[PDB]
Amino acid sequence: MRGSHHHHHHGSHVISSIASRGSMAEHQLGPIAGAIKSKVEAALSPTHFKLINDSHKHAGHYARDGSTASDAGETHFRLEVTSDAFKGLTLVKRHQLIYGLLSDEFKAGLHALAMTTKTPAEQ
Numbered sequence: 821m822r823g824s825h826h827h828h829h830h831g832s833h834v835i836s837s838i839a840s841r842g843s844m845a846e847h848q849l850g851p852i853a854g855a856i857k858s859k860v861e862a863a864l865s866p867t868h869f870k871l872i873n874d875s876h877k878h879a880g881h882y883a884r885d886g887s888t889a890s891d892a893g894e895t896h897f898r899l900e901v902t903s904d905a906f907k908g909l910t911l912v913k914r915h916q917l918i919y920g921l922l923s924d925e926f927k928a929g930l931h932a933l934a935m936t937t938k939t940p941a942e943q
Contacts, residue, residue, distance in 0.1 A: 845866060845867075845868055846868060847868070847870075848868065848869075848870040848871075850871075850872060851871075852871060852872075852924055853924065854924050855871045855873060855899065855920050855923055855924050857920070858871075858918035858919060858920020858921075858923070859918060859920060861917065861918050862901060862914075862917065862918045865903065867901060867902060867903035868901065868902045868903070869900070869901045869902075869918070870899075870900045870901070871898070871899045871900075871920065872897070872898055873896065873897045873924045873925070874896030874928070875896055875897070875924065875927055875928040876891060876928050876929055876930060891928075891929045891930035892930065892931060893930075893931070894930050895925075895931050895932050895933055896928050896930055897924060897930075897932040898932055898934060899915070899918075899920055899921050899934040899936075901914055901915075901918075901935075901938070902937055902938075903936075903938035903939060904938065904939040905937065906937065906938070906939040906940075907936075907937035907938065908938075909938060909940050909941055909942065911935070911936045911937065911938075914938050915934055
């Protein structure tokens with residue numbers, strides 16, 4: 821009751837290309853005013869802070885589209901921060917540190933979204 825055999829041979833070849841830019845830590849440039857103050861407090865570090873404020877004064881004068889003045893879901897103001905690209909610690913800490921949110925957005929009238937990602941400082 822003997823017997824044994826096997827075989828296998830399958831490969832391939834693929835060519836890839838190259839493409840990249842200068843590795844830097846700055847992909848934003850658009851200071852508002854009051855918010856800039858909060859970012860500065862964090863500017864002391866190599867981290868990055870992206871804040872964009874659009875605000876919403878009023879519509880035109882020919883549309884309406886069933887509008888009764890509300891604004892709750894669109895959001896025009898947002899504050900984000902990237903530190904070492906690695907969220908882990910209580911993000912609420914970074915946001916509270918700069919305490920920038922809820923500043924210029926209040927003038928907009930619509931909610932806002934913020935996301936801060938920083939490496940763990942306590943292991």
